[PDB]
Design a protein around this ligand. Structure first.
Ligand SMILES: [Mg+2]
Ligand SMILES: [Mg+2]
Ligand SMILES: [Zn+2]
Length: 406
DNA sequence: TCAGAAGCAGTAGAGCATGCATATATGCATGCTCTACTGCTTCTGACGATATCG
DNA sequence: CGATATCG
């Protein structure tokens, strides 16, 4: 999910990954990647009506994001309003107002996120300092020190705020394995399965639309088989991905999707209508790459687990784990840090108190001096009546006199 | 006698929300409201012929 | 034929 309101505190004139209610007054739109939770309001009728009444508002995103977005027929009205920006290329954006001729320049830099085709970061630099928006990123430990654009002369830049992805910001997802390990496990399993007979097929229950192209491409390169998907016209301008997918159902590896694909697999049938070739039945096994299932285990588990006679689960996460998030935020050391999404189990307060010790808040101060005036006793209640005998005791000490005047 | 006027019920067309599981992406499906418009049913009253009285 | 009151 995306708990972001698509509006930074430093630059409220730009909205990122959210165009629902208050972002209709923004001067520039930014899109991290092409996931549905980061595209709320992008197809709204009010936004459609606003686009046809303005000329200076644009939608900035990665070129791969533009290719994936313009392929959908529902978003083709953005064809003349999308401006793609290369990664690691500092460009100047003009936040010109429509009504008044006022203008404001800001410098944005796109950084790779390693999440899905077209996923990038947004690094803004303007009058209110430097802010960073890492929407659904994935960085291993020790990789934050390798980003060239986040360093200024060998040291980390002065970052004011970080709107980081906190999908797995909880002690349950302590150290998620790298995607290479899950890839190797899935490759070994699929090889050992399909190497027996040409009728052994492997399903890949991939929930997200984008993010699993790495697995498909590497399985195709290591097995020579082409994965089956529903639609592949979206990758028509991406040769390195298009030549690994196929619409034909006569392939072994499959990654097709369907709302009722579970019952179909239970009936020994892929999501595609084909259930057998040449009237010879097919032997199907299901591999579901996910991460939330592994975050609920109670003992030592493996990357490739077997939950049934023809069912498997793989730990394939496109989100940074708790340790990776902590390492990234501690290396950046920003003034503030806001969670974009709250975990299902965790709440807002726990994520906030986890992220706070990592922020650059190393500034303490002694409490303000509370004055003490007008003492709480006016009259001397401890006064004596001065009745004595004056003979049992020695003479009183005479009052001293001091005439020195410096 | 009957034209015309209320009064009420149904729908098109747009728009929006939520429910979906151990997924953080679902997009996808589904089901609801709103508003203007049309049609049917019930009601009313003026009206003209024609009955009746002079 | 008046023209008044029905009655549909
Ligand atoms: Mg997303
Ligand atoms: Mg994402
Ligand atoms: Zn298929």
């Amino acid at each position: 999910m995306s708990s972001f309101e698509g509006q930074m505190a430093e630059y409220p004139t730009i909205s990122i990954d959210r165009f629902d209610r208050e972002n209709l007054r923004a001067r520039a739109y930014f899109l991290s990647h092409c996931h549905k939770d980061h595209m709320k309001g992008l197809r709204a009728p009010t936004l459609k009506r606003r686009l046809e009444c303005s000329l200076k508002v644009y939608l900035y995103c990665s070129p791969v994001t533009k290719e994936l977005l313009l392929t959908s027929p529902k978003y083709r009205f953005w064809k003349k309003r999308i401006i793609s920006i290369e990664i690691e290329t500092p460009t100047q954006i003009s936040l010109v107002d429509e009504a008044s001729g006022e203008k404001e320049e800001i410098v944005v830099t796109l950084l790779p996120a390693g999440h899905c085709p077209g996923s990038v970061m947004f690094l803004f630099q303007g009058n209110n300092g430097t802010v960073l928006y890492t929407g659904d990123f994935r960085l291993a430990q020790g990789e934050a020190a390798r980003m060239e654009l986040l360093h200024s002369g060998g040291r980390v830049k002065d970052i004011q705020s970080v709107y980081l992805d906190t999908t797995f910001c909880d002690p349950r997802f302590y150290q998620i394995p790298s995607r290479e390990e899950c890839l190797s496990g899935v490759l070994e399993l699929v090889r050992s399965w399909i190497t027996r007979s040409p009728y052994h097929v492997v399903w890949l229950n991939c929930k997200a639309a984008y993010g699993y192209e790495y697995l498909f491409t590497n399985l195709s390169e290591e097995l020579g088989v082409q994965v089956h998907v529903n639609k592949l016209d979206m990758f028509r301008n991406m040769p390195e991905i298009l030549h690994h997918l196929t619409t034909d159902r006569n392939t072994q590896i499959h990654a097709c999707r369907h709302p009722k694909a579970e019952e179909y697999f239970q009936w020994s049938k892929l999501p595609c209508g084909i259930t057998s070739r040449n009237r010879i039945p097919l032997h199907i096994i299901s591999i579901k790459p996910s991460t939330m299932w592994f975050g609920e285990r109670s003992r030592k588990t493996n990357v490739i687990v077997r939950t049934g006679e023809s069912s498997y689960r793989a730990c394939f996460s496109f989100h940074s784990s708790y340790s990776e998030i902590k390492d990234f935020l501690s290396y950046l050391c920003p003034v503030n840090a806001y969670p974009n999404v709250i975990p299902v189990g965790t709440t807002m307060d726990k994520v906030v108190e986890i992220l706070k010790p990592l922020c650059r808040s190393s500034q303490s101060t002694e409490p303000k001096y509370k004055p003490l005036g007008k003492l709480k006793r006016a009259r001397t209640v401890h006064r004596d009546s001065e009745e004595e005998d004056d003979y049992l005791f020695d003479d009183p000490l005479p009052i001293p006199l001091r005439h020195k005047v410096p």
